[PDB]
Tab-separated table of C-alpha atoms in Angstrom:
chain	number	residue	atom	x	y	z
A	1	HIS	CA	-7.117	16.835	-29.843
A	2	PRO	CA	-6.417	14.676	-26.742
A	3	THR	CA	-2.896	14.193	-28.200
A	4	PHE	CA	-1.429	13.285	-24.765
A	5	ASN	CA	-3.806	10.386	-24.488
A	6	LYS	CA	-1.969	8.247	-27.062
A	7	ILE	CA	1.186	8.693	-25.035
A	8	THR	CA	0.075	9.192	-21.406
A	9	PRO	CA	-0.709	5.519	-20.632
A	10	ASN	CA	1.843	4.141	-23.083
A	11	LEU	CA	4.700	5.884	-21.300
A	12	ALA	CA	3.541	5.736	-17.680
A	13	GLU	CA	3.650	1.966	-18.164
A	14	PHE	CA	7.187	2.756	-19.379
A	15	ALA	CA	8.020	4.346	-15.948
A	16	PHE	CA	7.774	1.036	-14.107
A	17	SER	CA	10.068	-0.307	-16.813
A	18	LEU	CA	13.190	1.651	-15.964
A	19	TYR	CA	12.280	1.888	-12.287
A	20	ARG	CA	12.764	-1.826	-11.739
A	21	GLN	CA	15.894	-1.824	-14.012
A	22	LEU	CA	17.651	0.079	-11.262
A	23	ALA	CA	15.571	-1.517	-8.514
A	24	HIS	CA	16.943	-4.583	-10.356
A	25	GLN	CA	20.615	-3.701	-10.630
A	26	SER	CA	20.694	-2.124	-7.142
A	27	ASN	CA	19.886	-2.035	-3.356
A	28	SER	CA	22.370	0.892	-3.116
A	29	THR	CA	21.616	3.697	-5.660
A	30	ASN	CA	18.984	6.396	-4.873
A	31	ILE	CA	16.351	6.751	-7.583
A	32	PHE	CA	15.581	10.105	-9.138
A	33	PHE	CA	15.031	9.476	-12.797
A	34	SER	CA	12.698	11.431	-15.107
A	35	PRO	CA	10.241	9.299	-17.095
A	36	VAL	CA	10.559	12.215	-19.466
A	37	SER	CA	14.245	12.739	-20.429
A	38	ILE	CA	14.164	9.070	-21.401
A	39	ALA	CA	10.776	8.343	-22.985
A	40	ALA	CA	11.121	11.606	-24.919
A	41	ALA	CA	14.655	12.169	-26.300
A	42	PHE	CA	14.363	8.537	-27.393
A	43	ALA	CA	11.102	8.992	-29.267
A	44	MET	CA	11.734	12.573	-30.312
A	45	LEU	CA	14.156	10.657	-32.453
A	46	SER	CA	11.281	9.273	-34.549
A	47	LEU	CA	12.508	12.011	-36.881
A	48	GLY	CA	16.334	11.941	-36.892
A	49	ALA	CA	16.506	8.211	-37.714
A	50	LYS	CA	14.066	6.247	-39.840
A	51	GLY	CA	13.108	2.711	-40.877
A	52	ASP	CA	14.218	-0.189	-38.703
A	53	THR	CA	15.693	2.519	-36.537
A	54	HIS	CA	12.742	4.021	-34.679
A	55	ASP	CA	11.551	0.490	-34.484
A	56	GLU	CA	13.742	0.477	-31.382
A	57	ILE	CA	13.300	4.193	-30.545
A	58	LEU	CA	9.470	4.659	-30.381
A	59	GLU	CA	9.081	0.894	-30.704
A	60	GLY	CA	10.756	0.550	-27.379
A	61	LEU	CA	9.079	3.652	-25.964
A	62	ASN	CA	5.977	1.626	-25.270
A	63	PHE	CA	3.879	2.945	-28.174
A	64	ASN	CA	2.955	0.093	-30.546
A	65	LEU	CA	3.182	1.465	-34.126
A	66	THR	CA	0.344	-0.888	-35.111
A	67	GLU	CA	-1.840	0.189	-32.187
A	68	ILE	CA	-1.031	3.860	-32.617
A	69	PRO	CA	0.324	5.626	-35.789
A	70	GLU	CA	3.791	7.228	-35.489
A	71	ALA	CA	3.288	10.531	-37.366
A	72	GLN	CA	0.085	10.811	-35.280
A	73	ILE	CA	2.069	10.852	-32.011
A	74	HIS	CA	4.437	13.763	-32.515
A	75	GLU	CA	2.157	16.415	-30.938
A	76	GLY	CA	1.309	14.188	-27.916
A	77	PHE	CA	4.595	15.588	-26.770
A	78	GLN	CA	4.061	19.220	-27.947
A	79	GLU	CA	1.369	19.153	-25.259
A	80	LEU	CA	4.156	18.160	-22.922
A	81	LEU	CA	6.080	20.887	-24.862
A	82	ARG	CA	3.266	23.440	-24.757
A	83	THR	CA	0.801	22.246	-22.115
A	84	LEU	CA	3.726	21.382	-19.889
A	85	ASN	CA	6.204	23.834	-21.319
A	86	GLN	CA	4.213	26.929	-22.146
A	87	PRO	CA	5.608	29.751	-19.928
A	88	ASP	CA	4.540	28.257	-16.629
A	89	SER	CA	2.809	29.770	-13.707
A	90	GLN	CA	4.170	27.981	-10.680
A	91	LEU	CA	5.670	24.676	-11.934
A	92	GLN	CA	8.183	26.431	-14.232
A	93	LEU	CA	11.016	23.924	-15.046
A	94	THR	CA	13.978	23.825	-17.390
A	95	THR	CA	14.264	20.458	-19.163
A	96	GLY	CA	15.549	20.831	-22.717
A	97	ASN	CA	16.406	18.599	-25.674
A	98	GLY	CA	19.765	20.403	-25.807
A	99	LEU	CA	21.257	18.189	-28.521
A	100	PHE	CA	24.951	18.212	-29.431
A	101	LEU	CA	26.355	17.701	-32.956
A	102	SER	CA	29.819	17.831	-34.536
A	103	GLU	CA	30.980	20.836	-36.630
A	104	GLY	CA	31.445	18.310	-39.434
A	105	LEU	CA	28.229	17.045	-40.940
A	106	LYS	CA	25.373	18.144	-43.170
A	107	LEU	CA	22.357	16.574	-41.399
A	108	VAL	CA	18.852	17.254	-42.577
A	109	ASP	CA	17.652	20.809	-42.324
A	110	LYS	CA	14.170	19.338	-42.758
A	111	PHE	CA	14.655	16.554	-40.145
A	112	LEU	CA	15.695	19.622	-38.142
A	113	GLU	CA	12.503	21.293	-39.301
A	114	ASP	CA	10.686	18.383	-37.635
A	115	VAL	CA	12.445	17.865	-34.277
A	116	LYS	CA	12.970	21.568	-33.772
A	117	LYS	CA	9.553	22.779	-34.859
A	118	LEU	CA	7.735	20.393	-32.478
A	119	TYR	CA	10.240	19.247	-29.809
A	120	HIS	CA	12.080	22.561	-30.195
A	121	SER	CA	15.387	20.560	-30.230
A	122	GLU	CA	18.182	23.140	-30.125
A	123	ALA	CA	20.862	22.357	-32.721
A	124	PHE	CA	24.439	23.626	-33.264
A	125	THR	CA	28.060	22.811	-34.290
A	126	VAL	CA	31.177	21.745	-32.275
A	127	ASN	CA	34.565	20.226	-33.211
A	128	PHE	CA	35.311	16.984	-31.299
A	129	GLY	CA	38.971	16.917	-32.276
A	130	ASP	CA	39.806	18.795	-29.110
A	131	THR	CA	37.520	17.216	-26.508
A	132	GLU	CA	37.201	19.987	-23.905
A	133	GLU	CA	35.465	22.878	-25.635
A	134	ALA	CA	32.669	20.405	-26.246
A	135	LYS	CA	32.556	20.309	-22.417
A	136	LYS	CA	33.170	24.063	-22.488
A	137	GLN	CA	29.822	23.764	-24.335
A	138	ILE	CA	27.868	20.707	-22.922
A	139	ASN	CA	27.827	20.486	-19.133
A	140	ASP	CA	28.320	24.177	-19.828
A	141	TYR	CA	24.837	23.934	-21.319
A	142	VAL	CA	23.600	22.083	-18.264
A	143	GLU	CA	24.718	25.222	-16.465
A	144	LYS	CA	23.944	27.687	-19.275
A	145	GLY	CA	20.567	26.036	-19.357
A	146	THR	CA	19.864	24.107	-16.148
A	147	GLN	CA	20.187	27.400	-14.295
A	148	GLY	CA	22.883	25.337	-12.535
A	149	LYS	CA	21.466	21.974	-11.416
A	150	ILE	CA	23.320	19.376	-13.580
A	151	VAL	CA	26.516	21.428	-13.182
A	152	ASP	CA	28.667	18.322	-13.915
A	153	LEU	CA	27.264	15.078	-15.471
A	154	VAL	CA	29.913	15.083	-18.233
A	155	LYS	CA	33.429	14.246	-16.947
A	156	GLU	CA	34.887	12.473	-19.937
A	157	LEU	CA	34.573	12.696	-23.721
A	158	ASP	CA	35.887	10.944	-26.844
A	159	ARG	CA	37.675	12.469	-29.822
A	160	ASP	CA	34.894	11.550	-32.290
A	161	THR	CA	31.386	11.959	-30.819
A	162	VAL	CA	28.971	13.532	-33.346
A	163	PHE	CA	25.224	12.974	-32.601
A	164	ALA	CA	25.322	13.380	-28.788
A	165	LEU	CA	22.452	14.506	-26.497
A	166	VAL	CA	21.198	16.836	-23.675
A	167	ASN	CA	18.019	17.128	-21.501
A	168	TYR	CA	18.963	19.503	-18.624
A	169	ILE	CA	16.221	20.496	-16.037
A	170	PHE	CA	15.545	23.139	-13.371
A	171	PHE	CA	12.367	21.826	-11.747
A	172	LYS	CA	9.918	23.854	-9.720
A	173	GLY	CA	7.444	23.128	-6.961
A	174	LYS	CA	5.960	24.425	-3.714
A	175	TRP	CA	2.591	24.215	-1.972
A	176	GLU	CA	-0.441	26.419	-2.542
A	177	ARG	CA	-1.675	25.421	1.016
A	178	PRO	CA	1.915	25.213	2.388
A	179	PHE	CA	4.191	23.910	5.071
A	180	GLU	CA	6.041	25.410	8.043
A	181	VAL	CA	9.777	25.710	7.585
A	182	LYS	CA	9.545	26.121	11.399
A	183	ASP	CA	8.116	22.704	12.324
A	184	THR	CA	11.198	21.540	10.469
A	185	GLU	CA	13.649	19.714	12.724
A	186	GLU	CA	16.169	17.059	11.664
A	187	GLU	CA	14.877	13.729	12.970
A	188	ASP	CA	15.252	9.925	12.661
A	189	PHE	CA	14.252	8.603	9.167
A	190	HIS	CA	15.738	5.170	9.033
A	191	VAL	CA	16.926	3.086	6.105
A	192	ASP	CA	18.580	-0.293	6.626
A	193	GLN	CA	19.504	-1.652	9.996
A	194	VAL	CA	23.032	-0.622	8.918
A	195	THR	CA	21.793	2.770	7.662
A	196	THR	CA	19.689	3.750	10.660
A	197	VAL	CA	19.603	7.580	10.228
A	198	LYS	CA	19.016	11.059	11.692
A	199	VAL	CA	17.465	12.858	8.661
A	200	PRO	CA	16.581	16.583	8.250
A	201	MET	CA	12.758	16.089	8.514
A	202	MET	CA	9.819	18.580	8.558
A	203	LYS	CA	6.285	18.638	10.199
A	204	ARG	CA	2.513	19.570	9.781
A	205	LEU	CA	-1.165	18.432	10.177
A	206	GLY	CA	-3.152	18.848	7.009
A	207	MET	CA	-6.245	16.921	6.273
A	208	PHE	CA	-4.243	14.670	3.929
A	209	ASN	CA	-5.659	12.311	1.285
A	210	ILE	CA	-3.758	9.499	3.040
A	211	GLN	CA	-4.920	5.878	2.527
A	212	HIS	CA	-3.483	2.546	3.525
A	213	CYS	CA	-4.595	0.093	0.835
A	214	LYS	CA	-4.388	-3.713	0.760
A	215	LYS	CA	-3.614	-3.234	-2.979
A	216	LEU	CA	-0.042	-2.147	-2.600
A	217	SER	CA	-0.271	-2.141	1.248
A	218	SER	CA	1.463	0.995	2.383
A	219	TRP	CA	1.033	4.711	3.091
A	220	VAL	CA	-0.488	6.478	0.101
A	221	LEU	CA	0.054	10.209	0.539
A	222	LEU	CA	-1.098	13.044	-1.717
A	223	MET	CA	0.066	16.661	-1.843
A	224	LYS	CA	-1.123	19.710	-3.854
A	225	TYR	CA	1.499	21.837	-5.639
A	226	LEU	CA	1.344	25.428	-6.757
A	227	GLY	CA	0.828	25.023	-10.566
A	228	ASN	CA	-1.507	22.155	-11.709
A	229	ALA	CA	0.734	19.226	-10.732
A	230	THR	CA	-0.376	16.652	-8.133
A	231	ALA	CA	2.528	15.061	-6.209
A	232	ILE	CA	2.166	11.530	-4.835
A	233	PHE	CA	4.154	9.908	-2.003
A	234	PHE	CA	3.672	6.291	-0.901
A	235	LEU	CA	5.471	4.580	2.050
A	236	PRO	CA	6.119	0.740	2.300
A	237	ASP	CA	4.833	-1.652	4.969
A	238	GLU	CA	7.455	-3.947	6.523
A	239	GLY	CA	9.917	-5.536	4.119
A	240	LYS	CA	8.291	-3.933	1.090
A	241	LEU	CA	9.743	-3.435	-2.363
A	242	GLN	CA	7.622	-5.589	-4.681
A	243	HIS	CA	3.799	-6.030	-4.503
A	244	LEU	CA	3.862	-2.306	-5.070
A	245	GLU	CA	7.103	-1.847	-7.047
A	246	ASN	CA	6.014	-5.077	-8.731
A	247	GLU	CA	2.146	-5.134	-8.900
A	248	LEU	CA	1.981	-1.354	-9.491
A	249	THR	CA	-0.194	-0.349	-12.454
A	250	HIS	CA	-1.421	2.877	-14.099
A	251	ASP	CA	-4.824	2.182	-12.621
A	252	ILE	CA	-3.389	1.696	-9.114
A	253	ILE	CA	-2.668	5.418	-9.321
A	254	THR	CA	-5.583	6.528	-11.576
A	255	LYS	CA	-7.857	6.150	-8.545
A	256	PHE	CA	-5.553	7.792	-5.968
A	257	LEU	CA	-4.759	10.569	-8.419
A	258	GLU	CA	-8.491	10.923	-9.217
A	259	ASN	CA	-10.268	11.912	-5.981
A	260	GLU	CA	-10.150	14.979	-3.625
A	261	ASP	CA	-11.251	14.057	0.018
A	262	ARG	CA	-10.122	14.771	3.696
A	263	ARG	CA	-8.408	13.348	6.863
A	264	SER	CA	-6.179	14.864	9.631
A	265	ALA	CA	-3.161	12.811	10.803
A	266	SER	CA	0.507	13.794	11.550
A	267	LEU	CA	2.784	14.291	8.527
A	268	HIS	CA	6.568	13.613	8.887
A	269	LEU	CA	9.011	14.344	6.044
A	270	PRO	CA	12.797	14.124	5.462
A	271	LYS	CA	14.189	16.693	3.035
A	272	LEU	CA	13.934	16.645	-0.775
A	273	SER	CA	16.824	17.614	-3.068
A	274	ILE	CA	17.857	14.115	-4.137
A	275	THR	CA	19.428	14.597	-7.545
A	276	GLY	CA	20.107	11.600	-9.784
A	277	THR	CA	21.988	11.286	-13.074
A	278	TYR	CA	21.271	8.480	-15.486
A	279	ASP	CA	22.851	7.622	-18.823
A	280	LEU	CA	20.703	5.941	-21.411
A	281	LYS	CA	23.351	3.955	-23.316
A	282	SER	CA	24.006	1.862	-20.205
A	283	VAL	CA	20.452	0.372	-19.743
A	284	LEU	CA	18.679	0.949	-23.039
A	285	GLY	CA	20.512	-2.018	-24.560
A	286	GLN	CA	19.351	-4.798	-22.250
A	287	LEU	CA	16.096	-2.890	-22.568
A	288	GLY	CA	16.025	-2.879	-26.410
A	289	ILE	CA	17.293	0.224	-28.278
A	290	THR	CA	20.318	-1.823	-29.345
A	291	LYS	CA	21.749	-0.751	-32.776
A	292	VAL	CA	20.661	2.870	-32.164
A	293	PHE	CA	23.984	3.748	-30.517
A	294	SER	CA	25.542	0.763	-32.356
A	295	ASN	CA	28.719	0.796	-34.406
A	296	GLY	CA	26.732	1.788	-37.483
A	297	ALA	CA	23.286	2.070	-39.070
A	298	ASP	CA	20.722	4.604	-40.435
A	299	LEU	CA	21.476	7.308	-37.936
A	300	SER	CA	22.758	8.754	-41.270
A	301	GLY	CA	19.035	9.123	-42.020
A	302	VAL	CA	19.564	12.477	-40.318
A	303	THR	CA	22.620	13.278	-42.604
A	304	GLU	CA	23.734	10.465	-45.027
A	305	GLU	CA	27.525	11.156	-45.000
A	306	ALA	CA	30.038	9.772	-42.438
A	307	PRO	CA	27.685	6.908	-41.122
A	308	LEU	CA	26.342	8.397	-37.864
A	309	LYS	CA	25.826	6.450	-34.587
A	310	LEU	CA	24.609	7.579	-31.113
A	311	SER	CA	27.096	9.263	-28.788
A	312	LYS	CA	24.903	9.109	-25.621
A	313	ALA	CA	21.920	10.549	-23.693
A	314	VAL	CA	21.705	11.584	-19.984
A	315	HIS	CA	19.356	12.911	-17.265
A	316	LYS	CA	20.378	14.315	-13.832
A	317	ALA	CA	16.741	14.995	-12.824
A	318	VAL	CA	17.075	17.585	-10.121
A	319	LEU	CA	14.510	17.712	-7.289
A	320	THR	CA	13.126	21.124	-6.295
A	321	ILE	CA	10.409	20.555	-3.626
A	322	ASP	CA	10.090	20.175	0.188
A	323	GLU	CA	7.919	22.602	2.207
A	324	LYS	CA	7.701	26.170	0.744
A	325	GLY	CA	4.323	27.960	0.396
A	326	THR	CA	1.986	30.876	1.285
A	327	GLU	CA	-1.515	30.027	2.666
A	328	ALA	CA	0.742	29.137	5.704
A	329	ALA	CA	-0.752	28.173	9.094
A	330	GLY	CA	-0.601	31.571	10.771
A	331	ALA	CA	-1.775	30.349	14.172
A	332	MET	CA	-4.792	28.074	13.801
A	333	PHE	CA	-2.687	25.356	12.236
A	334	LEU	CA	0.523	25.886	14.242
A	335	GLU	CA	-0.563	23.213	16.693
A	336	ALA	CA	-3.120	21.912	14.294
A	337	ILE	CA	0.016	20.677	12.549
A	338	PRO	CA	1.238	18.120	15.028
A	339	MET	CA	-2.542	17.267	15.276
A	340	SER	CA	-2.536	13.560	14.471
A	341	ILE	CA	-5.828	11.788	14.004
A	342	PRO	CA	-4.898	8.753	15.893
A	343	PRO	CA	-1.947	7.736	13.531
A	344	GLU	CA	1.000	9.488	11.856
A	345	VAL	CA	2.779	9.820	8.502
A	346	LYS	CA	6.137	9.226	10.115
A	347	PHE	CA	8.268	9.248	6.974
A	348	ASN	CA	10.756	7.350	9.112
A	349	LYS	CA	10.998	4.442	6.528
A	350	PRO	CA	12.216	4.239	2.813
A	351	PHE	CA	9.363	4.974	0.420
A	352	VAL	CA	8.871	5.969	-3.205
A	353	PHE	CA	6.851	8.783	-4.895
A	354	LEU	CA	6.151	10.444	-8.270
A	355	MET	CA	4.754	13.665	-9.822
A	356	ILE	CA	1.549	13.395	-11.929
A	357	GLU	CA	0.139	16.195	-14.117
A	358	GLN	CA	-3.200	17.976	-13.662
A	359	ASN	CA	-3.076	19.010	-17.373
A	360	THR	CA	-2.470	15.313	-18.330
A	361	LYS	CA	-1.402	12.531	-15.850
A	362	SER	CA	2.343	12.836	-16.544
A	363	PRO	CA	4.929	11.215	-14.185
A	364	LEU	CA	7.582	13.943	-14.027
A	365	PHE	CA	9.859	12.072	-11.621
A	366	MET	CA	9.566	8.559	-10.261
A	367	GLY	CA	11.739	7.472	-7.353
A	368	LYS	CA	12.386	5.689	-4.096
A	369	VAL	CA	14.338	7.626	-1.521
A	370	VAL	CA	16.999	5.079	-0.473
A	371	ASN	CA	19.042	7.275	1.960
A	372	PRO	CA	19.880	11.021	1.932
A	373	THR	CA	23.664	10.513	2.150
A	374	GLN	CA	22.948	10.222	-1.623
A	375	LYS	CA	20.834	13.338	-2.502
C-alpha cells in the first residue's frame, strides 16, 4: 500500500507553489512555512465539505481527481499520520488538526467519523458570543498542545466564527553523528548590503554530501538527523533567488536526497529557531480555494443548518534544530572540524533548505533564511 506515493509528488510540487507566493509578495519576510499544515488541513477537508467544494480543497492541493481517485487518497496521509505520527523515536513532533467549532451546530457525526478516524481531527464545542474564551481555548490549544511554540498566533477574533482551524507543532531534530556546541561562536552571516550581519553561527568538519551543481548553481548541503528524516540545506551563488527558487523540481532533489557519499570541507552555520506563522485565508484565494471561506456554500455539507463558511486556518511552523547530538567528536574531530578540504560551507549568505522524510520523501518545512532579526 504505497499510499504516500499518490500524494508525495503531488504535494511536494505544491511546496514550490506557496514558497514563491511569499517569495513573490516579499523581499522582507523570513520563510518558515510547513508544506504540511497547508496541503493537509485543506485536503483533510475532502470530508467536511463535498461536491464543488473539495474541487477547490483537494483540487487545489495538487492532486488531480481524474488522475488520482479522492476516496483512494485519504490514507496517503494516515501514513503521514501513522508513519510520520506513530509515537516517534527521535523526530517526535506535535502538529495537530486541532479544529475549532461553535457550541451551536449539529455537524455530521459521520463526517466526524471520517476526519477523526483517519486524520484524528480533534473536535469540540465553544460559544463565539463572547470572543475571548475561544482564545482561552485556541492559542490556548497552541500552548495546551504545541508544548508552547505557537504561544500566540491568535490576537483577534470575531463574534461569529464557527468552523475555524488549528495545526499546532512542536518539532524535533538533532544529529545522530552530531555537532559541537563548543565550536559555536557568533560570526558574520550577511544578508543585504543594508543587512550585513553578525549572526550566532556554529562550526565542524564532517565529510559532508556537499555539491555545487550547475543545475541550481549553489551549495547543496545534506545533514543526517536522529530519526529517519534527511535535512537538506542549499546556499545561493551571487544574486540568486530564481534558477533554483524558479527552476527547482522534485527531481532536482530526488537525486540529492537519493545518494550517501563523502567529502571533508568546513561547515559554517548561523542558528536555527526561525519561527513563522502563516494564515491560509490570505493567500489561498489568489491561489484558488476561493468560495471555501466564502460568504456561503456547502460547508453545511458538514452540518446542513446555519449555512457554514470557513473561519480561517494557520501555521506557525516552529523550528527545532541546530547542532545537538551524541556521537560527538571527542578529540579526533575537534580539529578535524575546522578541517576544510580546500573550500568552506561558510553559511555567510542567505540560503534556503527543507526537511525530507526517510519513510517517504516528505518536505516538513521549506524556507529561505532571510535574516535572523526575524526568527
